[PDB]
Amino acid sequence: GSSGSSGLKMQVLYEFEARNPRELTVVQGEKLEVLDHSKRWWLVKNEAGRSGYIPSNILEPLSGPSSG
């Protein structure tokens, strides 16, 4: 893991709580990186290095000054 390939990044619109070893707890207003956005549930990771499943419903397209 190092500054390289630029995949996809998303933020948390609503805080969610995990209830399994596969899911990860996330808060609102947080910046996370997407890994697997294929299945109904998307997989993200945190700074700590932990990756868990989360509902894409709480994921928004981190807007930016990028032209368009």
Side-chain angles (χ1 to χ4, degrees), residues 1-53:
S2 78
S3 296
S5 287
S6 299
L8 150 68
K9 271 210 73 190
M10 292 197 104
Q11 59 189 123
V12 180
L13 210 59
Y14 304 107
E15 155 173 337
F16 171 91
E17 195 199 59
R19 62 209 279 186
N20 30 102
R22 63 170 204 181
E23 280 270 318
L24 168 87
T25 315
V26 292
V27 289
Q28 176 200 20
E30 180 151 72
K31 332 209 153 160
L32 296 163
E33 151 166 80
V34 178
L35 295 165
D36 169 60
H37 60 110
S38 180
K39 197 177 167 81
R40 285 285 165 72
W41 280 63
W42 296 26
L43 172 76
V44 304
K45 204 158 84 192
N46 47 8
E47 282 73 283
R50 287 172 284 196
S51 43
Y53 295 115

